[PDB]
Each structure stands twice: as C-alpha cells, then as structure tokens.
C-alpha cells in the first residue's frame, strides 16, 4: 500500500520512486555504514595481517615479532 511521501513518475501513483527511493535511501548510507565499518575493518586487519604476513618475515626475518599494533 501506498501513501507515505508518495510520488508521480509518469500517470500512476508512485511503485517506482517508492521503493526505488527507500532502497536507494539505504544503498546510499547504509551502503556506507557497513562497507566502511565492516570492510574498512576487513581491509584494515585483513590488509595488516597479510602485510605482517609476508613481508617482515623476510624483510624483518622474524615470523611473530612484529604485530600490527597500528
């Protein structure tokens, strides 16, 4: 059903701009709450883990030593 800010597209009520709006209204901030927590996350301990992984090993010679810690 149809009444909450509804809208006009071309000569019908609105069952476009309706959910095309709410689910654009999430893609567009709640595409930007998770993505940047939970893959800024991913990406910050994931990319450090993987850095820490394999690259002091050889350039640092040591395996555990050095953490992330940043």
């Known amino acids: ?34 993505g940047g927590v939970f893959f800024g996350t991913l990406l910050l301990i994931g990319f450090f883990r993987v850095v820490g992984r394999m690259l002091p090993i050889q350039e640092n010679q040591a395996p555990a030593p050095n953490i992330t810690g940043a």
């Open 1 to 34: 059903m149809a009444d909450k800010t509804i809208f006009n597209d071309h000569l019908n009520t609105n069952p476009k701009t309706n959910l095309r709006l709410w689910v654009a209204f999430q893609m567009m901030k709640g595409a930007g709450w998770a």
